[PDB]
UniProtKB/Swiss-Prot annotation:
Involved in the biosynthesis of pulcherrimin, a red extracellular pigment. Catalyzes the oxidation of cyclo(L-Leu-L-Leu) (cLL) to yield pulcherriminic acid which forms pulcherrimin via a nonenzymic reaction with Fe(3+). Substrates with small alkyl groups (cAA, cLG, cLP) exhibit weaker binding to CYP134A1, but substrates with larger hydrophobic side chains bind in a similar regime to cLL. Pfam families: p450 (PF00067). The keyword Heme applies. Keywords: Heme, Iron, Metal-binding, Monooxygenase, Oxidoreductase. It comes from Bacillus subtilis (strain 168). This is Pulcherriminic acid synthase. One of its GO terms (biological process) is pigment biosynthetic process. Belongs to the cytochrome P450 family. Heme binds at residues 58, 205, 261, 329.
Length: 379
């Protein structure tokens, strides 16, 4: 059945049950609802993410809207700085965890994760960490505008308010640093090219970008490590394993699930010929589960020889969770080091971590996916 819908409740309840069938039967799957093709095969996807002259993306300055080489520049402003934020990402985790020790339990997504990911992004932007609640809130409100297929008139209103709220918060902070630079990212954005309203739309995009996926990765890892208790023990003993666990969780259950692209000319991918101006969706989950790229692909295995940690976190990595080529996630380097730091602390701090009694595990999200909650218990 090619008639099946990939925006359907049924798809969303468990996408990994259906990818297999999309590849090998309807790889360039047309969705009759939007005017968009969903591409599910690894090589078909990777070629698209390789060449953004044919499959153009949306640039790193314009608004993340209703859904050239500052990359270089931003890349090193993360890269050079990620070793200055190492003690702060470190304190963030420790500070945020302290409430939940002794109680002996926590929900790593609701009690801990969302709030941690936000505080990191805030140190990277140099905003005042006291305001983390305001921000997580507004940050979701816009995240929604983007993630959602459609919205209620209440939500759409609320999302618009959040952007309004976000703008009027950041913008004075932009001018303050344009004239008195700090040593944060916003501070650098205003040094040696860019205008005020442009620097805002960039900050807004980095905020959206560094925040949501970080959350989800740490949680997906903890969950897949506790679900293979013997691999969890593997990580507990030799900590150098953390990155592979990060990586394999990335291939396994990629936080960002779809990558879109606009189509320049008329071009063929797979068996199907497409047409101009059309948005096609890369199905990352589907690609990281293609036998063609990974053997035993539906097995969480941190020790898999076909992962390749040497490059799991670069422009030319095996999995497509960070995208591919010259448009790969700008903070890949940063993503590694951030998640690494928490994971390590979590393990250090929640001795004898286990899943809570009667913990029923569930995931949510079409564009970006992750656990609704992860209920863990500890000493
Ligand atoms: C859990 C780790 C992360 C994952 C899996 C991830 C994944 C991705 C993916 C798949 C893309 C789209 C590639 C494309 O279509 O061009 C992307 C874009 C991007 N990422 Fe990440 N990312 C992560 C963490 C981060 C962090 C920590 C930062 C900032 C330090 C960051 C900054 C960006 C930026 C600026 C973009 C460009 C998209 C835009 O224009 O808004 N990412 N990321
Ligand atoms: C909502 C939140 C974040 C994203 C995103 N796109 C690339 C990296 N992160 C997309 C939608
Ligand atoms: Mg973060």
């Amino acid at each position: 059945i090619k008639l099946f819908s990939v925006l359907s409740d049924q798809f969303q309840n468990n996408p990994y049950a259906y990818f297999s069938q999309l590849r090998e039967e309807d790889p360039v799957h047309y969705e009759e609802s939007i005017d968009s093709y969903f591409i599910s095969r690894y090589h078909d996807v990777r070629y698209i993410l390789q060449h953004p002259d044919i499959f153009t993306t949306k640039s790193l300055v314009e608004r993340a809207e209703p859904v050239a080489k500052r990359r270089i520049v931003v890349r090193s402003f993360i890269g050079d700085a990620l070793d200055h934020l190492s003690p702060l990402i470190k304190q963030n985790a420790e500070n945020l965890l302290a409430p939940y020790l002794e109680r002996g339990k926590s929900d790593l997504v609701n009690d801990f994760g969302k709030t941690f990911a936000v505080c990191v992004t805030m140190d990277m932007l140099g905003l005042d960490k006291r305001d983390h609640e305001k921000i997580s809130e507004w940050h979701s409100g816009v995240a929604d505008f983007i993630t959602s297929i459609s919205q209620s008139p209440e939500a759409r209103a609320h999302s618009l308010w959040c952007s309004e709220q976000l703008s009027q918060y950041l913008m004075p902070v932009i001018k303050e640093r344009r004239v008195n630079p700090g040593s944060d990212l916003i501070s650098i954005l205003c040094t040696s090219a860019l205008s005020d309203k442009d620097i805002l739309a960039l900050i807004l995009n980095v905020l959206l970008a560094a925040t949501e996926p970080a959350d989800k990765t740490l949680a997906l890892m903890i969950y897949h490590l506790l679900n293979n208790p013997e691999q969890m023990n593997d990580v507990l003993a030799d900590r150098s394993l953390v990155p592979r666990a990060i990586a394999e969780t990335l291939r396994y259950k990629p936080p960002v699930q779809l990558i879109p692209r606009q189509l320049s000319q008329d071009t063929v991918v797979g068996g199907m010929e497409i047409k101009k101006d059309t948005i096609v969706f890369c199905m990352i989950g589907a690609a990281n589960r293609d036998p063609e790229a990974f053997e035993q692909p539906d097995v969480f295995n941190i020790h898999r020889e076909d992962l390749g940690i040497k490059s799991a976190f670069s422009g030319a990595a095996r999995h497509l969770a960070f995208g591919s080529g010259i448009h790969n996630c700008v903070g890949t380097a940063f993503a590694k080091n951030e998640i690494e730091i928490v994971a390590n602390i979590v393990l250090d701090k929640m001795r004898n971590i286990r899943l809570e009694e009667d913990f029923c595990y569930a995931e949510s999200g079409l564009y970006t996916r992750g656990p609704v909650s992860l209920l863990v218990a500890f000493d």
